[PDB]
Amino acid sequence: VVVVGYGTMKKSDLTGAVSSVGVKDIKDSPVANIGQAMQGKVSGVQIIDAGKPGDNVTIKIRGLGTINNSNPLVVIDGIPTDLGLSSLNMADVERVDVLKDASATAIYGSRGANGVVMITSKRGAEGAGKVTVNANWAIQNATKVPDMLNAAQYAALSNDMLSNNDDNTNPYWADPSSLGKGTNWLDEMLRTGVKQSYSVSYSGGTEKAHYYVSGGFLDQSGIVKSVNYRRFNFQANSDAQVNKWLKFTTNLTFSTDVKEGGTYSIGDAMKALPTQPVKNDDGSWSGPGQEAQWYGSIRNPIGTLHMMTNETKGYNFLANITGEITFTKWLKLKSTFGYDAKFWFADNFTPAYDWKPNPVEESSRYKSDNKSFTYLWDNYFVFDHTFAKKHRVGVMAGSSAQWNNYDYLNAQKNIFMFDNIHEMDNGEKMYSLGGSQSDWALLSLMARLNYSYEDKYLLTATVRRDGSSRFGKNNRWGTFPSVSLAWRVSQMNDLKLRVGYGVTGNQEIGNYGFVASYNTGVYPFGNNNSTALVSTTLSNPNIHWEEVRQANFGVDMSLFDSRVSLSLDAYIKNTNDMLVKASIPITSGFEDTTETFTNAGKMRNKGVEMTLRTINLKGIFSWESALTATYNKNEILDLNSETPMFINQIGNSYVTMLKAGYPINVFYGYVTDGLFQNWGEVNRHATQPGAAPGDIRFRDLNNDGVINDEDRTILGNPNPNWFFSLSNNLSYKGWELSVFLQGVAGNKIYNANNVDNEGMAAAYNQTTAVLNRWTGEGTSYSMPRAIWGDPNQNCRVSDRFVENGSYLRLKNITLSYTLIQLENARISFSCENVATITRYSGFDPEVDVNGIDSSRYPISRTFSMGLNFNF
Amino acid sequence: VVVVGYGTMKKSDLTGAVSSVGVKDIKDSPVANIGQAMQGKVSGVQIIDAGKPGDNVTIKIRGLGTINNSNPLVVIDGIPTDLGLSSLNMADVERVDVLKDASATAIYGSRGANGVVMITSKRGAEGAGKVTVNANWAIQNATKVPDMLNAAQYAALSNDMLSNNDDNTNPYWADPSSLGKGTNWLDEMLRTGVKQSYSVSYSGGTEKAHYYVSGGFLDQSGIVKSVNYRRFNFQANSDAQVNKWLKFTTNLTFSTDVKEGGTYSIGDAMKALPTQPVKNDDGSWSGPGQEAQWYGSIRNPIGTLHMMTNETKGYNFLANITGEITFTKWLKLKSTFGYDAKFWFADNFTPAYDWKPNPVEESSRYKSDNKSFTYLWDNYFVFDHTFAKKHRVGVMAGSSAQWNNYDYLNAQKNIFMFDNIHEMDNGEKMYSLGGSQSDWALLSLMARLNYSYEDKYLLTATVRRDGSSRFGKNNRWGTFPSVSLAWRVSQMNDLKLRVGYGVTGNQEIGNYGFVASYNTGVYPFGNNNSTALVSTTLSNPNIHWEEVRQANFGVDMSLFDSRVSLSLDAYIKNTNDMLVKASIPITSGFEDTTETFTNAGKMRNKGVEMTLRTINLKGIFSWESALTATYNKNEILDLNSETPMFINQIGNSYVTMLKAGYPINVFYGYVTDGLFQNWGEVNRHATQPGAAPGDIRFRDLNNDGVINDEDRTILGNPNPNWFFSLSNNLSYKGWELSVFLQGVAGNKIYNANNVDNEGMAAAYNQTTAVLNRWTGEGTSYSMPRAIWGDPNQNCRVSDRFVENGSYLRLKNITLSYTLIQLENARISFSCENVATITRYSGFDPEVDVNGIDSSRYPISRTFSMGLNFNF
């Protein structure tokens, strides 16, 4: 069975698009959190990894919905919470269910617009008690590392750059070959990480009672020099039947985590000169020389990493108590109470040290505290009866309530005298101090009806009325109806058609968005000053949710004597009342620069999803496979404006651009043609400031003869079009082998790291791609010359830094064998990210949503061995 | 059965002094916390109430042991914690056991020197499930309120005082009778409190599993105008038998509390003049006039109470997981892990207001955070076998470990502009900021042996080795052996004799007591200054625990066909290695003013305890009774000094005094003889500065003719000698009546409130006892005259302010009757502190340990009605 919110339903009776992940999938994954364990295992959901331990992945369902927060809703044991997925132990997760179509997400009303993720924990089973012990060890190494120049090559490049600009060169760098090799910062900054995990739990069952107690421990070290992560978990579940008409359920969760790490930056490491030794002759940390144009101004990364310490602690508590009263055979009442408390603490300390480029003469300590409490209370009725042995009617109706509180505080001191003893009482000079508070509330009413007719025609209807404090006084309440249909053709072995339609909403618009902002002012009287309030950012009492309408069609098929399955889904999603920039009339007394928003935007998404599974080979050898494909298309309809929006500034210009009729986050820049070879080509070409031979030539889109801002166009679409995956499973006498494939094609990636690593206009270490630069006529046709300051602006926004993002990756290969009194015993060996096929030149093709790569944490490759016991 | 630590034992097999409180006692108590519910119910334990909601009572076992922290040790479900008793729900407490003699407290070693309190929670029972619902409502009112003068009487007193000192009087107070009555501050400051409590729980049982889930809510309002207290509780217990040789136990506890209250003071209320109206004609708060000698300088208490707000929140988490492995039939292994986390938060805010005596022109906010985490891990073996069907041997041995961490932080800001919006971001001026950290650890080894011989001779031996980080490097480890004997004469129906002897220790000496303190200094060089450290309070690497030796004798009897019981206990307790002030030689480079301590003090305590129970009447009427008596004597042997120690300064002099050969905290002051009647008596009496007719005459202890400091002696002993109580219970056809008596006699109380309320030397409101003062020759013989400034120092430390502390109180009278499908239903009516018989003149005879009363929270009288359901 599957969970669809406020109840359970069979898979065969589902009238919407519901996808589930079983225990058999998440059983030997070497990943830490559950988020990385379901990447590519489900259709219609895109998951992007992060890499840093303790972080969470990014989940997007059926493409981007708005230009605002579009993250889905996470529900844990019926409690909608904001807890991160990295804080949940994977060893005690039963199954994960994802709701995509509006026919199933309408039950949540004002929150189920971007999809709902359901997580269910394990429970005890009837019979004798069981004890399960698990362990795992792993090592991690970086996948791909860019190649940088050595001391001699950098010296030659610097000499060429300074000679081309008619500037004095380094007196002792006239013989680059004598310098040698130098120091590699990337090799010293990276190491091999070690990950170990342990878990133990026991469970039992009885016809009237059940119990389950778990607990685990995890320790992980990052691939960089100083990052650590620890996590402790504990969970207890219970279920008792007090009498015939009473029943109780209890779920408790507790977890802690500790995060460490120094001050580091990948960009600074990639820009550190290879001619500088790590340490001086006396052991002190080195630094750049006095001449900025010869040594740069990059502070030593290793010193900052090994001298600065950052720490963070967190504590999380989750509770859930559920009751149930049985009045008659066909009537039940259910009550549920939820609790959730979180705490955060931060601690930073920067010792005072005389750094060569910029010394630090003031040691400081930073601390911060955080709290948050969330409550829930749900009450609803359950009805189920059969009429004339054919008609089945199921009606559920009730209410819900939820509110939250938040607070924080931070401070800082200085001096501290001795570095070893740096408690808060040691310092004397206070630096900063502040805090605030926020809260919100929500109320709702729900009603759902289910109908069946001879197992040949199913009809479901749902209506929900929601009211939140985030909305204005004029749009406090709203209604989100829904309806779906499903019938079977059989009553080619089976066939089923599903049609649905519903309306949902999104309320992630922040808090206190209907209140203007005032700044304190004074008005001089004859001899006294009186404080006055000046209004700014006028109130908007018409702010409400964002409307989303969706239509879905589904087909279910079974072929070859119920051996293979097929699933086809086509959806059209429309977004209305999107928040966009508003227009402020001059007669209103305010200026247009005020940041006021209104519900006027629109967006449209559509695509097709596919799923196919085959189980062909049987007998001694068992072979299974699963093919998943997904297509999506994005389009922006209106933005309530006549001018495009420019965001995501890189360098001194904006990269992305938003315009009606085009996909989101599309690039916008110049187009490169070639390289100048002589003055004759420059003279007869269109005018261009700072033109010289060996520079990049830009095309003239408009026939005006002048290269200017108007010569820009769309470069590429960061949103991919095709998502695909493939899995295989073999089994023969205990031995089993699993191979998983995953890849994404149809997107472009903007490499922002190459802006400074290929510009050759500053004292930054370059990559190996600058060796074949333009040093004369006919020497090269793609790589320009080296010049200090870049008068021609060869590093501007153009198609030079745009690369294909399509890739195919071998995700996981796992081989395990099944073996004092014991019941079960298995040993597993697995690997992650064994190989990758792509044309991208960088750390990893996996980038963020808008396709911009700028000093991201590298993705590692993991080799692990497992172990599993069972008493 | 009873719990004695790391196991259980039958009551009949106990070889030491162990007392227990059953469920039948704590079943209808209207008190909030468990501490107030066991006052006088147990012999050898003294409990003093507090009165303020959310506070904890003071517990002392068999008299004071040291001049330092002598509070006992609290153990909850085998976890030694510092959690207050007010944070525990009384509805789910099974029984409370107290260990007194050293023969039973030696198992805890370095912590069981002042007694151990054991608290056990309820657990599920085999059979069908049960549901229990409880409710209670109550009201509270002050018991006794002192009587103060009115406007006319105060005006007359002020006129007399100013005329006797030859000073100008109030021009418009020449006719006191025209003033009227005035305002009573005590009547306005006090109200009637309301207390309500609810609880609900369910439990079940199975031959292999058990469970128990509880939860409650409590709200209480104090008798003063603005004090509130709320508490939420939740607890879940489980016990499962996975297989034949495995077993697990789990206990979880969670609780929160919120405390409020303004700025108030009983002393200021009792000193406010009755001629000042509460508010002015325009509604603003009133205040004292410009003339200090006519109106005083007492700020308005009502305004401070209603304008200043203080808030405090707390969160507590307690966990306990226990395992057990059975190797053979006569061998078992047990493991236990304990967790404990606490959080505190504070919030204060004082609005700026122009108070008449001292205006406040700066509004400030104060915040504070607290954390504390404690861990435990115990592992020990259990052996039990029978030899030759007669000899029974039980051996237990193992280890233990425990450590703790602590941290805190606080800050403050000012201005805040608007009072309504006072978030931390509003303020601009930082005021203060600080924090610190502390920790400790402990390790131990344990071993206990039990022997039996034909149920006629029992021998028990126990040895424990402890090591803590609080001790010096020279006394890291120690040993605490023990031994006891017991045999039965029968093998007058039964007879049993118990003899025991053991050595325990106390380690409540603080943290980092072996580390000297340094202060930063500078030393001027030729042109620069270098920081230097100056040593102070030299290190003491010889600091260790405090040794206590105790011998106990016990007799158990049964008379009249096992109808009545009797218990006699005699104990002698000696204290060694007590921490006292040390002597610093001049050659050591330090002064005598340094606060250094060493183990040199001694103390001795002894007494007799009695217990008697009768169940005489049977049949339709059931009558039961219990008589408890206790005698104790205290004595101080040595203090490693030749001069008495003076502490507890009141006014401008010290009251208490410590000296060898005398009890602790004994008073020390002058002795009053009478009142001067004429100048002839003054002239022929011993010299006395500021002598005048109508003043108090002090006796001359030494025949020197001069009244000076040497004319002081011991006034009284605050430590009582006799503790007694009596209880009765009736039952007839559901109806039951219970009457409980309790009283303490043999102690003196020093009334520090009368120092300012009877001195008549300042602008303070006086009590009604000043009406019959000395206004002429022969007018009075006890009450002196009224004079401004008190030249004779009539309010000095003497026997004038010493009153008898003996009292007898009617504690509780409870009447309850035993009555839709239901199983049980009862309605209960109860009262608390119905009447009190005493000669003390004050709020209540219940005072602190040293017998000093100074502006304490009044003790209220409670009337309550109960209700109990059972499904």
Author numbering:
A (entry chain A), B (entry chain B): 112 to 602, 613 to 940, 948 to 999
Q: Can you quote the paper on this entry?
A:
Glycan uptake across the bacterial outer membrane (OM) of these bacteria is mediated by SusCD protein complexes, comprising a membrane-embedded barrel and a lipoprotein lid, that is thought to open and close to facilitate substrate binding and transport. Here we show that for both the levan and dextran utilisation systems of Bacteroides thetaiotaomicron, the additional OM components assemble on the core SusCD transporter, forming stable glycan utilising machines which we term ‘utilisomes’. Transport-competent FOS are generated from levan by a surface-exposed lipoprotein, a GH32-family levan endo-glycanase (GHlev), while an SGBP (SGBPlev) is thought to recruit levan at the cell surface. Single particle cryogenic electron microscopy (cryoEM) structures in the absence and presence of substrate reveal concerted conformational changes that demonstrate the mechanism of substrate capture, and rationalise the role of each component in the utilisome.
Initial biochemical characterisation indicated that a utilisome existed, but cryoEM of the dextran complex revealed it to be much more aggregation prone than the levan utilisome. Despite this, initial 3D classification revealed that the SusCDdex complex is intact, (i.e. a SusC2D2 tetramer), and that the SusDdex lids are open. The positions of GHdex and SGBPdex were initially assigned by rigid-body docking of AlphaFold2-predicted models into additional density decorating the lip of SusCdex. However, unlike in the levan system, no classes corresponding to an octameric dextran utilisome existed, which we attribute to a higher propensity of the dextran utilisomes to disassemble/aggregate, potentially at the air-water interface during cryoEM grid preparation. We did observe heptameric complexes, containing two copies of the SGBPdex and a single GHdex (ED Fig. 6a-d), together with hexamers and pentamers encompassing all possible complements of GHdex and SGBPdex (ED Fig. 6e). For levan, GHlev is nearest to the hinge of SusDlev, whereas for dextran, the SGBPdex is nearest to SusDdex. Despite this variation, for two distinct Bacteroides PULs these data show that all OM components required for utilisation of a glycan are assembled into a utilisome.
